[PDB]
Amino acid sequence: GSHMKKYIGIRMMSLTSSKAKELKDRHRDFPDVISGAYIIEVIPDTPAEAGGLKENDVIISINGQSVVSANDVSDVIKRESTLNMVVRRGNEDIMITVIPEEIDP
């Protein structure tokens, strides 16, 4: 153990069958899929807010990868230095780039 587990300053969870379905019941504006990470909250001082994301979207891809759950997003943040998550807004797809930070307690 020396340098591992990056830091982006954001909370994400694995959209389980329960939650994934709970969203469709509440906000009837999400696709018919059940794979991807859900954004919980973002700290006012992190690459997340600086990159151009929000705590009301859903991750799916990253730097040319397919994410399904939070566990998948984590390894990516610590595996890839450059993160390129695509977020769909309105009726067009957009590419978001966020660079994590290094930190060790």
Partner: peptide, 7 residues
């Protein structure tokens, strides 16, 4: 479940 990942 929740399962929050503060990454």
């Amino acid at each position: 479940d929740s399962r929050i990942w503060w990454v």
